[PDB]
């Protein structure tokens, strides 16, 4: 299957912006726990948020809990990220990951299988 990275963009900062992810293909949706991660120049790609399935439950990476808001839409096999305060900090390039299975802490890279190719979200003063 393939994941697709719709939102994105450049934003001010203390302004909003919402990424969303859809996976494409056929063989259920139900059973893929889904991973939102971020990179920016120079650091590494760390995790941002996630929200394993049979349930829904979300997970945030520290820097980022309060603002961004993970969920998912398992009739449009959706994964949608909302960032509320974005700030400098949030400025990376953003991917979309999944993989079948369950987890119950706020994932690593080594979790997911199919990723997205990313999206470009540029936060500025």
């Known amino acids: 299957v393939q994941l697709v990275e719709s939102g994105g963009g450049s934003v001010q900062a203390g302004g909003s912006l919402r990424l969303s992810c859809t996976a494409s293909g056929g063989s259920s949706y139900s059973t893929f726990s889904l991973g939102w991660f971020r990179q920016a120049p120079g650091q590494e790609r760390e995790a941002v948020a996630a929200?394993?399935?049979?349930?829904?439950?979300?997970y945030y990476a520290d820097s980022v809990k309060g603002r961004f808001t993970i969920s998912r839409d398992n009739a449009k096999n959706t994964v949608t990220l909302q960032m509320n305060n974005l700030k400098p900090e949030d400025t990376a390039i953003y991917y979309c990951?999944?993989?079948?299975?369950?987890?119950?802490?706020?994932?690593?890279?080594?979790?997911?299988?199919?990723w997205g190719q990313g999206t470009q979200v540029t936060v500025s003063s």
């Open positions: 990951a999944a993989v079948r299975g369950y987890f119950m802490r706020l994932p690593s890279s080594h979790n997911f299988r199919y």
């Open positions: 929200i394993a399935s049979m349930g829904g439950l979300t």
